């Protein structure tokens, strides 16, 4: 291998081979990508362009 | 450390090796004592 970074992706972690997990040499860390809280939801709406047609108050709302 | 690692597989002793080595490389500290417990639970 000598120089491969693996990134696996799943919406169904229950159905992952458990052997994949927590071995150095194959997926040493897992990261949960969760739903956004309010602050992140507001950050998203700003970079996405909601500001084109919404006031700062309508975005907060 | 051989004493404290009862019930470890060779694999887990290897996964312990990378961890203590990384801390030792990153920090200059190896907390074997701390990390066997972290691996048990």
**CB contact at 8 A, B32 and B20:** yes
Resolution (A): 2.7
Structure tokens at A12: 């169904």
Residues 6+ apart with CB under 8 A from A51: A45, A59
Structure tokens at B30: 């190896």
To the nearest whole Å, the CA of B11 is away from the closest chain A CA by: 8
Asked if A24 has any chain B CB less than 8 Å from its own CB, the reply is yes
Q: DSSP secondary-structure letter at A3?
A: S
**CB contact at 8 A, B39 and B12:** yes
To the nearest whole Å, the CA of B3 is away from the closest chain A CA by: 23
Residues 6+ apart with CB under 8 A from A8: A20, A27
Contacts of A23 in chain B (CB under 8 A): 11, 15
DSSP codes, B2-29: TTT-TT--HHHHHHHHHHHHHHHHHHS-
Torsion of CA B23, A9, A42, A47, to 10 degrees: 100
Write down the experimental method used for this entry. Answer: X-ray
Of B27, B24, B1, B28, nearest to B12 by C-alpha is B1
Name which of B12, B13, B15 to mutate to probe chain A: the one with the most chain A Cβ atoms within 10 A of its Cβ.
B15
């Amino acid at each position: 291998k000598e120089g491969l970074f693996l990134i696996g992706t799943t919406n169904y972690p229950e159905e992952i081979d458990p052997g994949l997990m927590n071995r150095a040499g194959r997926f040493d860390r897992a990261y949960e990508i969760g739903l956004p809280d309010e602050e992140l939801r507001l950050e998203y709406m700003k970079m996405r362009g909601f500001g084109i047609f919404l006031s700062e108050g309508e975005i907060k709302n | 450390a051989a004493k404290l690692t009862e019930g470890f597989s060779f694999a887990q002793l290897g996964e312990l090796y990378v961890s203590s080595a990384l801390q030792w490389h990153q920090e200059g500290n190896h907390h074997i004592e701390t990390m066997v417990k972290d691996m048990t639970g």
